[PDB]
């Protein structure tokens, strides 16, 4: 967890989305105490190095910055939200909400595919992508 | 991570700048009153006290980066 | 009045409450409105309990004016208590309500 | 002892304070929410005193 940095103001969130031109900006929105927001914080931290060349990761806490709760509508322990060139990206995991991510993904590998898929599709301006594995059943 | 370092906003709202898209009291208190009227750390913590002893020279001379596989 | 005052604090003018405690909304609520309007069973529960009392009281009111009947009134009251699941909707928000519903079914059979 | 009002005193008070939102019923606002756990209580006392079918 101490690998991955944290964002302590909503102004750290916004500049961080802007200044990274060439890579995804992946953010976990959720709060330290949570059962499920700790688990994801692991599965990302392990992956963050492998992917440094196309994706950048950060951590944010709903309690630290609540400014973003209404606009993106944040419910539940945590939401993974992908950004490329200020454009909110979007993917269908078969789960019935195409915005963000909720459920906890299981393998390191299946997580890297999703990041890679989003980036590759995203690079072409495509706003939707399809997660190869569709965990509607899972979540 | 240069921005991470800096620390100052303009007195600015987060949503707007990026270009964001969303996809008597005393009496009450009195009334209220009239009504009122971890494991891991425990396991370890005990070890952590154990550490206290160690000298500052030893803290320095600690081997640094050993790979065994 | 209490429930409407609560609603007013939200400022949700579109949502309206009629005199038989039916909540009517003029238009669909944006996502932000939907979030903010989310509430516990008690508002729904409070509203439905008041609806029950209004049924009872109105029966006596008609009774004062003669609409209610020494016999019709009594039958109405029995009807109301046996038809609460079918008169309110409480169970929607809290299923365990089923416990009352089943009791009313059984009393309906008995009586 | 809090000797009780005759009858009309409460009828007028309520009639005066009818509007749901009052700038003035301002310390009823904070206070009113605090005394919100006794509604249900009122209902119980109302219901248990229904008039019976032989009483006008």
Swiss-Prot record, chain A:
Keywords: Cell cycle, Cell division, Deafness, Disulfide bond, Mitosis, mRNA processing, mRNA splicing, Nucleus, Phosphoprotein, Spliceosome
Record note on what altering residue 37 to A does: Viable when expressed in S.pombe
Phosphoserine, modified sites: 131
GO cellular component labels: cytosol; nucleoplasm; nucleus; spliceosomal complex; U2-type precatalytic spliceosome; U4/U6 x U5 tri-snRNP complex; U5 snRNP
Disulfide bonds: 37-78
Keyword Translocase appears in the UniProt entry: no
Intracellular or extracellular location(s): Nucleus
Example of a GO biological process term: RNA splicing, via transesterification reactions
PTM notes: The disulfide bond seen in structures determined by X-ray crystallography and NMR is not essential for protein folding and function.
Stretches assigned to coiled coil: none
Oligomeric and partner information: Component of the precatalytic spliceosome (spliceosome B complex). Component of the U5 snRNP complex. Component of the U4/U6-U5 tri-snRNP complex. The U4/U6-U5 tri-snRNP complex is a building block of the precatalytic spliceosome (spliceosome B complex). The U4/U6-U5 tri-snRNP complex is composed of the U4, U6 and U5 snRNAs and at least PRPF3, PRPF4, PRPF6, PRPF8, PRPF31, SNRNP200, TXNL4A, SNRNP40, SNRPB, SNRPD1, SNRPD2, SNRPD3, SNRPE, SNRPF, SNRPG, DDX23, CD2BP2, PPIH, SNU13, EFTUD2, SART1 and USP39, plus LSM2, LSM3, LSM4, LSM5, LSM6, LSM7 and LSM8. Directly interacts with CD2BP2.
Function: Plays a role in pre-mRNA splicing as component of the U5 snRNP and U4/U6-U5 tri-snRNP complexes that are involved in spliceosome assembly, and as component of the precatalytic spliceosome (spliceosome B complex).
Family: Belongs to the DIM1 family.
Protein name: Thioredoxin-like protein 4A
Organism: Homo sapiens
Gene expressing this chain: TXNL4A
Curated annotation (Swiss-Prot), chain B:
Annotated tissue distribution: Widely expressed.
Signal peptide (from-to): none
PTM annotation: Phosphorylated by PRP4K during spliceosome assembly.
Top-level taxon of origin: Eukaryota
Modified residues (Phosphoserine): 45
Subcellular location, record wording: Nucleus, Nucleoplasm; Nucleus speckle
Noted disease: Retinitis pigmentosa 60: A retinal dystrophy belonging to the group of pigmentary retinopathies. Retinitis pigmentosa is characterized by retinal pigment deposits visible on fundus examination and primary loss of rod photoreceptor cells followed by secondary loss of cone photoreceptors. Patients typically have night vision blindness and loss of midperipheral visual field. As their condition progresses, they lose their far peripheral visual field and eventually central vision as well.
UniProt function note: Involved in pre-mRNA splicing as component of the U4/U6-U5 tri-snRNP complex, one of the building blocks of the spliceosome. Enhances dihydrotestosterone-induced transactivation activity of AR, as well as dexamethasone-induced transactivation activity of NR3C1, but does not affect estrogen-induced transactivation.
Protein name: Pre-mRNA-processing factor 6
Shown stretch of the complete protein: 6 to 167 of 941
UniProtKB/Swiss-Prot annotation, chain D:
Location of this chain's protein in the cell: Nucleus; Nucleus speckle
Domain of life the protein comes from: Eukaryota
Disulfide feature: none
Expression across tissues: Widely expressed.
Subunit: Part of the U5 snRNP complex. Component of the U4/U6-U5 tri-snRNP complex composed of the U4, U6 and U5 snRNAs and at least PRPF3, PRPF4, PRPF6, PRPF8, PRPF31, SNRNP200, TXNL4A, SNRNP40, DDX23, CD2BP2, PPIH, SNU13, EFTUD2, SART1 and USP39. Component of the U5.U4atac/U6atac snRNP complexes in U12-dependent spliceosomes. Within the minor spliceosome, which acts on U12-type introns, interacts with PPIL2 and RBM48. Core component of U2-type precatalytic, catalytic and postcatalytic spliceosomal complexes. Found in a mRNA splicing-dependent exon junction complex (EJC) with SRRM1.
Domain remark from Swiss-Prot or TrEMBL: The MPN (JAB/Mov34) domain mediates interaction with TSSC4 and SNRNP200. Has structural similarity with deubiquitinating enzymes, but lacks the residues that would bind the catalytic metal ion.
Role noted for this protein: Plays a role in pre-mRNA splicing as core component of precatalytic, catalytic and postcatalytic spliceosomal complexes, both of the predominant U2-type spliceosome and the minor U12-type spliceosome. Functions as a scaffold that mediates the ordered assembly of spliceosomal proteins and snRNAs. Required for the assembly of the U4/U6-U5 tri-snRNP complex, a building block of the spliceosome. Functions as a scaffold that positions spliceosomal U2, U5 and U6 snRNAs at splice sites on pre-mRNA substrates, so that splicing can occur. Interacts with both the 5' and the 3' splice site.
Protein name: Pre-mRNA-processing-splicing factor 8
Organism in which the protein naturally occurs: Homo sapiens (Human)
């Amino acid at each position: 967890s101490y690998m991955l940095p944290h964002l302590h103001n909503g102004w750290q969130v916004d500049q961080a989305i802007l200044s990274e031109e060439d890579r995804v900006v992946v953010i976990r929105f959720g709060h330290d105490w949570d059962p499920t927001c700790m688990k994801m914080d692991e599965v990302l931290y392990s992956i963050a190095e492998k992917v440094k060349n196309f994706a950048v990761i950060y951590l944010v806490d709903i309690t630290e910055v609540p400014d973003f709760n209404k606009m993106y509508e944040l419910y539940d322990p945590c939401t993974v939200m992908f950004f490329f060139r200020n454009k909110h990206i979007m993917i269908d995991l078969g789960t019935g909400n195409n915005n963000k991510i909720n459920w906890a993904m299981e393998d390191k590998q299946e997580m890297v595919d999703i990041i890679e898929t989003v980036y590759r599709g995203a690079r072409k301006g495509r706003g939707l992508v399809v997660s190869p594995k569709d965990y509607s059943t899972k979540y | 991570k240069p921005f991470l370092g800096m620390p100052a906003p303009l007195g600015y709202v987060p949503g707007l700048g990026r270009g964001a898209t969303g996809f008597l009291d005393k009496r009450m208190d009195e009334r209220r009153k009239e009504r009122r009227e971890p494991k891991i750390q425990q396991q370890f913590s005990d070890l952590k006290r154990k550490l206290a002893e160690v000298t500052e020279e030893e803290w320095l001379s600690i081997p640094e980066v050993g790979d065994a596989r | 009045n209490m429930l409407n005052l609560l609603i007013h604090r939200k400022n949700l003018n579109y949502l309206h409450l009629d005199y038989n405690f039916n909540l009517k909304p003029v238009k669909t609520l944006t996502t932000k409105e939907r979030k903010k309007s989310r509430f516990g069973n008690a508002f729904h529960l409070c509203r439905e309990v008041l609806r029950l009392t209004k049924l009872v009281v109105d029966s006596h009111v008609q009774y004062r004016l003669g609409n209610v009947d020494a016999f019709q009134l009594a039958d109405g009251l029995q009807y109301i208590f046996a038809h609460v699941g079918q008169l309110t909707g409480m169970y929607r928000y809290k299923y365990k309500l089923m416990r009352q519903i089943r009791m009313c079914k059984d009393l309906k059979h008995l009586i | 002892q809090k000797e009780d009002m005759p009858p009309e005193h409460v009828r007028k008070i309520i009639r005066d304070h009818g509007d749901m939102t009052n700038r003035k019923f301002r310390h009823d606002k904070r206070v009113y929410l605090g005394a919100l756990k006794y509604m249900p209580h009122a209902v119980l006392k109302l219901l248990e005193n229904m008039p019976m079918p032989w009483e006008q």
